[PDB]
């Protein structure tokens, strides 16, 4: 028997990156899996992933979603990603005649945790069993359950302190100010939209997390104690979810340019798939990787869609800077196979903005992290990462996005990551912690198996 | 619902390949697919293969074949590769209780076209569906089923049904010796293969014509299983790396250029041929990659071309645009890379099959090959003539565009709608 399994996807490499992983897995575990599309993506990224995979896996049936025409000045934002998420919300009631279609017939509809609050309706009417892919942290996905309760609880929300903290049940307080800057703006697409998932998670059958519990201390088993003696969905670690093969084009020029580089000298520098650096910012950052005297692999965006990232990095900074960079670094503004860099032996050295997936794939091939928050989950995340003893996180350099650090500090910074034993150390750990939980016998391949049983 | 499919392997890196190439398939087309392997394999190459495909394909589990300790006296033959099909067939009851105890139950097994005999008895004692996994061509497979039938009865002529008849100086040298081990085998395997439920062949319809539903239709009369064309078996996603040391040259190379030739992993040109085959290939005044299994010029042969002494991609080699000729030994593996990335060969048959696989490059329209070379283990080739023969390849425009032709029709029978999926489609709704 094979369960047939449907992923619905939303929008960007951060959503996207685990969904596609998690398919691939699925495969590989004797079940049918159809991935459910919409085009035309953001960015160009997002439609090269997709044409890899199904590459790959012949085996993946696509059926794709037509989203309704939809109007953007409608919306609250001018953010691209947050603007199609709302697309695809909107054509909620349009998905029901779309998996009646699809033979043979479901077991289990697996959401984007961006889409939960309208698509979990959808999947109820169907009978279906509907399993959130959250693409975060666990600590992260407990705030997004909570703030609702939250929000509530204040007669005036905009008189509230960051030194005020918001409760979460199994986990250690969060400040308001490590709360992602958007959410003290109620009212803004991106609050509205994650208020009403995080009041919808209780009813799906079910919360797939991309970690694993040695990660998180342990605390998780007893977490799912309390939360099934208050019907509560449990919360499944799946993690880590392993990058697909497809994901190793072994010719690259970057990773070229590692194979001439000492053993764990080399610093790599990546702020996500959706974000980019003010000029300042980068102009600073430019100067702080040559004061670090690390050899440092850099990836530059200008522009949240690499789409529209048209303008060559000369016009930033000049070809004077440019060209002197490049002396004492790699620096490429292009897309780089981010999971082969960092399996690489050169890099010893993470500087991250705190995205989940990153964290993750820094945790599979065991590299230190600097954590650099810019905005989101970040903040959330870069605790999390710091509990585990695998990075370091400067939180005198706040958000990243309302706060300059100039170059001077970052050089120094980057000096203590690259001499910072205990997060070497403890990388090698958490590594060989990593690889055993998805091994037979693993704590998160046996939730897997359990998952299937029950589909089944 | 998973039909769980069980692929039965044998030795020989001709007749793994396919078998690899089939079980990802399988897999690609919603089955569960276990094969029964046996070490140690003959050579480093099945090895490899095997452990890379049970590293891209997790999902296909391995079940080993012990077997029985084999006498190499009583051989007919001192060849490893049959050597170790005997030593296998020999112990071919030892499969059924391997069998039975696979997990979830089985619906279907597949057995290599050289254990046929042996072990479609195995699959009658369990109610399974056997399957014939012929590592051919479709005339050659009529060969082996009507050749016992035709020694119970040189310029003479063999009946073969649905094709034409075939010259006896087609037939394979070592088939007019029936000591030997391998001869031995064939008569029992082509007598045995009316006991499977059918037999499948790399290749799809319109390479062979519109005959395979004629055929079809008469064996179905005389209850014969039918001729299921499932081709062409694509390589897996483990046969492709982005870069290799030929490859590299390749790409400095002017489009369609470069003459490729290669004569298989079994077989080994003769020292004699190696100094003739190279100096006609500096006559052809041609780029060319050679590959050389097993010298003052040899830097000078260098100047114009590329020589490599390993195992290559020659898949990747293939498709790429600077190679425009194909010298081959005619395998069917390698005949059926050359036909998917539509590139004209020059068949040079060195022994087996070859001469008839020739046969079925030339009726296509695809090749062309030399009836005054022979055999190549029989008959050595002078360098003028090498390189006179070449030049035609590399200038026959019919060629070049009959390639393109057969390359269309073979991409549009794998595609959705397409002449072998529908095959396919069908075969895994039986199992269900
Ligand atoms: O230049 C890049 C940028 C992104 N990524 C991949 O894109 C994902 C980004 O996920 P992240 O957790 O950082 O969330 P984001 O903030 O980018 O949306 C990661 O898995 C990276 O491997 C990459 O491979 N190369």
């Given at each position: 028997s094979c369960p047939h399994v449907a992923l619905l996807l939303s929008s960007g490499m951060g959503h996207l990156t685990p969904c596609l992983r998690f398919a691939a897995t699925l495969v590989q575990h004797h079940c049918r899996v159809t991935i459910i599309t919409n085009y035309p993506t953001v960015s160009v990224a997002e439609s090269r992933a997709i044409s890899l995979?199904?590459?790959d896996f012949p085996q993946i049936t696509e059926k794709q979603f037509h989203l309704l025409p939809f109007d953007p000045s409608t919306a609250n934002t001018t953010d691209p990603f947050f603007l199609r998420w709302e697309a695809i919300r909107r054509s909620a009631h349009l998905l029901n005649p779309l998996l009646s279609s699809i033979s043979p017939p479901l077991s289990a509809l697996v959401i984007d945790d961006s889409l939960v609050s309208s698509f979990v309706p959808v999947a109820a009417n169907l009978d279906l069993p509907s399993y959130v892919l959250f693409t975060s942290?666990?600590?992260?996905?407990?705030?997004?359950?909570?703030?609702?309760?939250?929000?509530?609880?204040?007669t005036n929300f905009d008189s509230i302190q960051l030194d005020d903290v918001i409760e979460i049940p199994g986990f250690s307080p969060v400040p308001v100010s490590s709360?992602?800057?958007?959410?003290?703006n109620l009212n803004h697409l991106f609050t509205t939209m994650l208020i009403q998932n995080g009041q919808s998670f209780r009813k799906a059958n079910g919360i797939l997390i991309n970690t694993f519990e040695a990660l998180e201390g342990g605390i998780l088993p007893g977490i799912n104690?309390?939360?099934?003696?208050?019907?509560?969905?449990?919360y499944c670690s799946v993690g880590p979810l392993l990058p697909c093969k497809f994901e190793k084009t072994e010719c690259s020029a970057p990773v070229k340019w590692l194979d001439d580089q000492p053993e764990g000298s080399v610093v790599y520098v990546s702020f996500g798939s959706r974000f980019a650096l003010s000029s300042e910012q980068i102009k600073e950052l430019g100067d702080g990787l040559i004061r670090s005297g690390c050899r440092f692999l850099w990836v530059v965006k200008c522009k949240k869609v690499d789409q529209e990232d048209e303008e060559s990095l000369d016009e930033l900074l000049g070809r004077d800077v440019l060209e002197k960079i490049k002396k004492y670094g790699f620096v490429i503004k292009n897309w780089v196979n981010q999971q082969e860099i960092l399996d690489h032996r050169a890099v010893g050295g993470f500087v991250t903005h705190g995205g989940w997936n990153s964290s993750m794939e820094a945790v599979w091939h065991?590299?230190?992290?600097?954590?650099?928050?810019?905005?989101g989950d970040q903040?959330?995340?870069?605790?999390?990462?710091?509990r585990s003893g695998l990075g370091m996180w400067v939180k005198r350099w706040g958000?990243?996005?309302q706060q300059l650090v100039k170059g001077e500090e970052i050089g120094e910074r980057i000096k203590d990551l690259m001499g910072n034993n205990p997060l070497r150390v403890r990388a090698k750990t958490l590594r060989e912690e990593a690889r055993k939980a998805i091994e037979v016998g693993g704590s998160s391949e046996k939730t897997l198996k359990e998952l299937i049983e029950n589909w089944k």
């Open positions: 995979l199904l590459s942290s666990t600590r992260a996905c407990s705030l997004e359950e909570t703030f609702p309760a939250f929000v509530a609880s204040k709360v992602p800057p958007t959410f003290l104690d309390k939360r099934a003696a208050d019907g509560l969905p449990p065991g590299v230190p992290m600097l954590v650099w928050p810019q905005f903040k959330i995340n870069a605790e999390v990462i710091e958000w990243g996005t």
